[PDB]
Paper text:
The full-length AD8 Env and its lysine-rich derivative, AE2, which contains changes that favor the functional pretriggered conformation, were expressed in A549 human lung epithelial cells. Membranes containing the AE2 Env were cross-linked with 3,3’-dithiobis (sulfosuccinimidyl propionate) (DTSSP). Extensive 3D classification of the AE2 data resulted in two 3D maps refined to resolutions of 3.8 Å and 5.0 Å, designated AE2.1 and AE2.2 respectively. The other two protomers in the AE2.1 Env are translated around 1 Å toward the trimer axis relative to their positions in the AD8 Env, suggesting a more compact AE2.1 trimer structure. The α9 helices in the three aligned protomers of the AD8 Env trimers exhibit rotations of up to 7.4°. The extent of α9 helix rotation is even greater, up to 11.7°, among the protomers of the AE2.1 Env trimer. By contrast, in the interprotomer interface with the smaller opening angle, HR1N forms a loop that is well resolved in the AE2.1 Env; in the AD8 Env, the density associated with this loop is weaker, likely indicating a higher level of dynamics. Interactions such as a potential hydrogen bond between Thr 51 and Glu 560 could stabilize the gp120–gp41 interface in the AE2.1 Env, allowing the conformationally labile HR1N loop to be resolved. To evaluate the potential impact of the cleaved Env trimer’s quaternary structure on CD4 binding, we rigidly fit a gp120 core structure bound to two-domain CD443 into the three gp120 subunits of the AE2.1 trimer structure, including the glycans that were rigorously built according to the density map. In the interprotomer interface with the smallest opening angle (interface 2 in Fig. 4a, b), CD4 encounters a tight fit with the Asn 301 glycan on the adjacent protomer.
Residue numbers in the entry:
A (entry chain B): 520 to 664
B (entry chain A): 32 to 139, 144 to 146, 150 to 309, 312 to 321, 321A, 322 to 395, 395A, 396 to 464, ...
C (entry chain D): 520 to 661
D (entry chain C), F (entry chain E): 33 to 139, 144 to 146, 150 to 309, 312 to 321, 321A, 322 to 395, 395A, 396 to 464, ...
E (entry chain F): 519 to 661
């Protein structure tokens, strides 16, 4: 339930309000359903070393891996909070030529990130290192004074 | 006019990805401790309320011919069958010369010519000191003639494989299986009422779990599968290539009443330590050949439909021809499938014997009473030994089911092969029934689905900026 | 160590003492025994088999997700930080119309959950939805 | 006016079932026992066990329905299956046997064929030549076929596969601390007296269970735990007769058991390198295996048990200890494993005591310390152990070279109350029971209940979000 | 700059800047994340059932997950869960290595410095937990 | 006053032992050829490995106590066992064999009786007929029994169980990358010359080992890694004797090996679907397998190794290169696998030099191919190969159709310093070694070590908390 099926809508309207409500719905749901089924089956003890059981165990690992890598990344860039955080990293001129309206009201999320793929590693690295190190230095200076 | 990088979690963004799938069947299947069912033991509970969020303004591309799930679950059910029969008896000692009678007796009208066989032999159990003469019953399909001495015979795949009987208790009724994905992954559903199986799909939704899919395996005729919507739909890798099989999904379910009208007493000979070879004891009453009931008009109407469809695909001014399989392994030559566990090889010659015309295909068939459309009866056989489709090795024996057996499958699909014979200036297109490939019988259920991982991380410029 | 010793005590007795501090130590001890065990066995390599190798592996899994599913809950309502955190959700009198004396100085945590068992899921989902309203207010402030 | 406040780390548990792992402290592993019952997989135990006391707690306990009893049952089944899995199947030795009387008549010799020197023909790795040879078998192992005053086989050969237990693997019991994973806890009922299931007022909690020796024994409990201050009777329904009666003793009764023979351990090469192990011969007199019980001590314990059984079924009823009714050898005769060797001991002497409520009187001891202090249990020996749950999967115990000497501690009983026509008489006829490993484990895990830990909690407080 | 633990030979101050890069790869598992995606096979045929490598790879995954989980749990128990760097109210008892900050941040490398402190590592960690418990009790006193 | 400051992601590592996974190149999967005994399970190699260098670092290494050697040793053993375990057991074939030394006395032929046309009687899948079937074997596979001129069997029957390799599975080794799970790292010594134990001048790190081809070779290291500017000699104790001496070469020596026989593979069917693969016959003339080796190249290589050995055992030394003393063919006669077939080559020619004190230094020159007539290696074939550390579990190598062609590069030598009573002579002798998969692993893993990365860190800072 609450699966983000608003890929067709551009970040112009859905991202501002509709997606965040749906995202909170999905995060709570994909947590409630998965762990509900897990608890029920674990009590039943039907789970075993059987072929299907090793498929379930492999998937249980993948869920954990995906969730943990995501949360790690988020915490490694300070955004341990909610789904929307604003970094102090400027937008490089190398990726541009699109107006705020283009990026938001005209470009769908799937289409937008499909042009940033050549720069995804650079953007993610230059976010985590910049803001996190700078904020650590600031905290240290404030505590010293 | 300053734009800063802003991280957004939960963006509606997915990418093509292949992953592990896990089964989910039914709480009711667990109820009554059926156990014998070889597929529901480790399945998680199906969510009673499915989640089918619809996608709007989306035209996702789909390639059912390049579907991961197909191969995934293909090897899954290939291994799943192997694990189920792995603890069961290996019928290695049975590979012995057999003294086989006529039927059992000449107490004679006579529609049989050897189906009972009454193969007798001398075999050694775990007691490796005493030969133990006895006898069992086998349809000619399982007894290969040897030595041409007259009544010398052996099991069909003794010199090519190892025959393992299924554990008698093991029941072989498929139950709906809902593939579900680990979180962060989703299944995309191509909910268009008409898909070529290739190219972009407009009407599109998604599910975290596939709909119920019975892993019914059948050749030529798809049984208890899924129905097409409003129109019969034909999907091929390459229609103009002859080698490519042709998936034909019917929009109408056709009832096929198959039965084994022989009351059978079942005898369990003990061979080895606690290992028991289950075989037929005898048949109570007269033996009647297994038959299947097919409505003539309903089938002919479906024939008209698929014929018009193949004309539309190729040339609407072509003659269509329907022949039977050229030759090869029994599975492809005749419609074979499991019924209550016993396997029936029905000579579906009559099913594909009608040739239509571009000039023809004008009207349909209307029955004038029950005796008008007297249901066609298909000459069906029983093959107890089945070699794996992929490898002649590890052939599996089917324990005989005691007494009466009767099934009522609904034909939801067809498998066809075009032969590129020299009929260029004839336009006479011949299509022959094809099978022998489990993957083809899964492509006919997985086409609407597609697995994509979800990467809910996204970044975009915003005039907002982190406080210093 | 640091196991639920104050579970026989009432909600308030337990809260003013062990729940705030001993339970924090209990989570640390859970990590300490795991840190020692998961290391020493990693210096064995006779582990990670099937007959008991799968048993311990399954247990380690179950611990992992059983802990994450709670972290996730904390994340969905924002309380990923302090173990004790309040909510903007008003306690509806419909859920157990009893005075705070009967709630804390009387009911113990074990019997408290049984009366609130029907409310549990309802309240947990209400807390996250209230967080969404607060997040929308935060966007307005931004 | 109040708001719900999320509470993490709340003292709340719930009954649940979960995977549990073994833990042996690796003392056996450092010794180098070559993996006994999979000791190389048990994680080392905590140096100091923790048992926090749960004051003002009345947790209900249900030992009969406890998941641990069945989880352990299946895990122990898997252990015994893994042990025999790589071992040598004995399919070729399912043949006819030419057997002598014992070893010779140059023998007093009360034994009447317990060695039955059997000889036969076999096919070794060289699958072209027979090889006559002789090995020794106790009568329990060999069944005679056709009764032509000769010709023998093996009891389960035709209907069941046998697998010889590997000699490198010892079968000595080792303590196991079934430890629960984090987020779960084991509740420990510390009442001085219990009825199997019921509310417990003295309760504690343990991260791992106490060391447990998974011994499979019938009609007796060996190397087990001791009750507190009083013998305790436990049964799901004492009022019905079909259910077994679990008894736990307050004191230990030493059981000196030994096979007093020097045995040469001949090995026969069978197939490609697979060596079937047997007994060459027995140097010296073939003294029958026997067990030593204190006559006074066992009577005193039997009178304690009787008084407890009287309490259960009224003072009017008198307690009768009759011998096992009949059935499989393990049920009819008390049977265990000594030093990797399985015994079979007649239990008639232990269960031949009738107690009248009028004559109960006191406990009978002896000023004399010499004589009438030893109850010698006539023990026979069986190597081919039939599986307890399934007809197939029978196992073979290789003989242990030399004399095998053991000394356990009788720590309880497994009994069966019968529906006799002596109900008008008012006599409770109690007979030894066995054949179910779950009862053996119920005698240990009764005091434990598995509950998950839910640190999540909600609570109305005057506190409100600091928005 | 440095791809991985380049600041290993660098002192305390130099290694602080690259901490985020070294902390991203703790659970990143980039080599393991992608399975046989290029050949479109998941986990090389679900680890070929349970092949020797299948077991090895699956076990290596749980260790990356538990090791990071344990590290994050430690961060959580002392409060500074999300924060990679956090001050503590624990006064630095002068007994542990009597050295000036200059020698530490300008001369002593992190790898060489965590051979001295190994003796008192557990002591220090528990001090942090008790200081957080003291902070919680002080908060209760304020309420 | 200072306060503790918890640091996260700090570059501090501690020597640790952990499980590692294999990551072969994407190209190996692209072939779609069935797994080569250890291949499909592996994850794909990351296009470019990160070899980040660790400047200002002096990390100590211990190649002789590295866990990875043992871990991989066990991995390669288990990988072979799993690959050949589903295949056919050749236990039914342990039968008396009637053999002719040569099918035709075509005199001529170098073989005196290598062909040994052995015809046996085997029960087929049909357990009713004995079918006399001929098969071809080498002397190394058949033991003469009964002292009869034609009575033969197999080397490992009563001794061990033979299992043939599945023909579809090939044997061409492929480069493998050992990668650690995140939070762990591998340190690579960058020192041009390394003793293998002790501090490293330049250190680097890789999350993945360089590609290693797990070739198993004796007295030689084939298709192995090379040294830098100088042949390196490593041994835990050079002053010891039993310690095998590892040598890594700086220059690769090409070795061209081929079995020059066109062979047809008869597939005899034995039992229910189990088909044993043998040799139907040899097409054309029969030529013994050999290997080609440059004279000068080998001599100059021996010159460099002899200099290195005088350096490590006193400047004034005379090193005699001799052959193995005796024992199993594995370590006496250099052996390896060419195209999935085992080759045993008598490398007596390679080490037949007495040497001079000052004869060294003048490197010999190639004055034409007539001068440098390439060294010919008398090679044999042993189809039945035994487990190196296990008496049982022997494996049969199916024959390969056609003529095999191989061209590996010599990259290393294994040596054994004998402690002969010749200290006054100062004639150091170094016999070829081998016989241990670990020795091969140590040669390629010397530069690697695995360390857990602890991101948790402590440090006093003036910074304090916010009350
Ligand atoms: C791999 O490489 C090796 C190395 O090149 C090849 O083998 C080499 O072959 C060389 C000959 O071709 C051989 O050289 C001979 O060495 C003999 C002994 O060497 C020592 O002694 C000499 C002389 O020192 C003496 O005097 C001092 C005091 O001044 C004393 O202290 C000493 O103890 C000695 O008494 C030194 O020069 C060396 O350096 C060593 O210390 C010599 O006897 C020999 O001299 C001549 O006599 C030999 C017969 O006795 C004869 O075989 C040889 O050819 C010499 O013949 C002379 O006369 C003829 C005719 O006039 C003339 O054409 C010659 O040119 C020569 O003048 C040589 O000096 C190397 O010792 C030897 N090295 C090794 C390690 O074996 C090997 O072939 C090659 N393999 C391949 C496959 O390529
Ligand atoms: C893609 O999805 C759309 C929307 O569901 C499909 O269009 C729908 O087509 C059906 C007929 O096939 C229409 O039903 C008709 O509705 C009208 C009134 O709207 C009624 O008068 C008719 O009797 C009939 O019931 C339906 O309205 C129509 N929906 C829309 C929104 O136009 C379309 O067929 C799908 N295409 C594919 C390729 O799947
Ligand atoms: C073990 O012994 C206990 C007693 O120590 C038995 O428990 C008691 O059994 C009775 C009847 O089975 C329970 O019912 C009672 O009935 C009266 C009828 O008026 C009612 O007034 C009581 O208050 C109660 O309902 C009783 O609850 C139960 N427990 C106690 C503490 O008495 C038990 O049956 C024995 N066996 C087992 C397996 O526990
Ligand atoms: C099913 O229909 C689609 C749409 O017409 C076909 O896809 C097109 O293929 C042609 C080439 O034959 C291209 O020129 C078009 O651009 C394609 N359209 C798109 C966007 O998909 C598809 O080939 C048909 N498939 C079958 C099996 O007939
Ligand atoms: C037991 O039953 C008694 C019935 O009368 C008794 O009959 C016999 C057994 C005599 O020996 C004597 O015990 C009695 O006269 C009841 O009187 C008695 O209360 C019942 N219960 C007890 C506590 O014994």
């Amino acid at each position: 339930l609450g699966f983000l099926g608003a890929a067709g809508s551009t970040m112009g309207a859905a991202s501002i309000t509709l997606t965040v409500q749906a995202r909170l719905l999905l995060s709570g749901i994909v947590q409630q359903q998965n762990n509900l089924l897990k608890a029920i089956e674990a009590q039943q003890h039907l789970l075993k070393l059987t072929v299907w059981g090793i498929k379930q165990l492999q998937a249980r690992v993948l869920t954990v891996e995906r969730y943990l890598r995501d949360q790690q990344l988020l915490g490694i860039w300070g955004c341990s909070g909610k789904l929307i955080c604003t970094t102090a990293v400027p937008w490089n001129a190398s990726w541009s030529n699109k107006t705020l309206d283009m990026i938001w009201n005209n470009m769908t999320w799937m289409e937008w990130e499909k042009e940033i793929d050549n720069y995804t590693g650079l953007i993610y690295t230059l976010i985590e290192e910049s803001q996190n190190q700078q904020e650590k230095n600031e905290k240290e200076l404030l505590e010293l004074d | 006019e300053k734009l800063w990088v802003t991280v957004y979690y939960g963006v509606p963004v997915w990418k093509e990805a292949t992953t592990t799938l896990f089964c989910a069947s039914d709480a009711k299947a667990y109820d009554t401790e059926v156990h014998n069912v070889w597929a529901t033991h480790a399945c998680v509970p199906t969510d009673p309320n499915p989640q089918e969020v619809v996608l709007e303004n989306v035209t996702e591309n789909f390639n059912m011919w390049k579907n991961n799930m197909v191969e995934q679950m293909h090897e899954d059910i290939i291994s799943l069958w192997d694990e189920s029969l792995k603890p069961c008896v290996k019928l290695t000692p049975l590979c012995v010369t057999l003294n086989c009678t006529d039927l059992r007796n000449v107490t004679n009208s006579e529609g049989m010519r050897g189906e009972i066989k009454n193969c007798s032999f001398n075999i050694t159990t775990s007691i490796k000191d005493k030969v133990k003469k006895d006898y069992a019953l086998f349809y000619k399909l399982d007894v290969v003639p040897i030595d041409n001495d007259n009544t010398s015979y052996r099991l069909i795949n003794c010199n090519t494989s190892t025959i393992t009987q299924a554990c008698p208790k093991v029941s072989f009724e498929p139950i709906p299986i809902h593939y579900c994905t680990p979180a962060g992954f989703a299944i995309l559903k191509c909910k268009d009422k008409k898909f070529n199986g290739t190219g972009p799909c407009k009407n599109v939704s998604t599910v975290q779990c596939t709909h119920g899919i019975k892993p019914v395996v059948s050749t030529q005729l798809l049984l208890n599968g899924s129905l097409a919507e409003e129109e019969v739909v034909i999907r091929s890798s390459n229609f103009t290539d002859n080698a490519k099989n042709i998936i034909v999904q019917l929009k109408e379910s056709v009832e096929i009443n198959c039965t084994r009208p022989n009351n059978n007493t079942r005898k369990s000979i003990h061979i080895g330590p606690g290992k028991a070879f289950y075989t037929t004891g005898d048949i109570i009453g007269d033996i009647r050949q297994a038959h299947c009931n097919i409505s003539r008009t309903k089938w002919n109407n479906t024939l008209n439909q698929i014929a018009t469809k193949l004309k539309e695909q190729f040339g609407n001014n072509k003659t269509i021809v329907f022949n039977q399989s050229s030759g090869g392994d029994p599975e492809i030559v005749m419609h074979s499938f499991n019924c209550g566990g016993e396997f029936f090889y029905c000579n579906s010659t009559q099913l594909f014997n009608s040739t239509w015309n571009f000039n023809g295909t004008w009207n349909l068939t209307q029955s004038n009473g029950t005796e008008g459309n007297d249901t066609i009866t298909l000459p069906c056989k029983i093959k107890q030994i089945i070699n794996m489709w992929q490898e002649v090795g590890k052939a599996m024996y089917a324990p005989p089911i005691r007494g009466q057996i009767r099934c009522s499958s609904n034909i939801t699909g067809l498998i066809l092969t075009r032969d590129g014979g020299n009929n260029h200036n004839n336009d006479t297109e011949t299509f022959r029934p094809g099978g022998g490939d489990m993957r083809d019988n899964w492509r006919s259920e997985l086409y609407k689905y597609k697995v994509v991982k979800i990467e809910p991380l996204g970044v975009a410029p915003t005039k907002a900026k982190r406080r210093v």
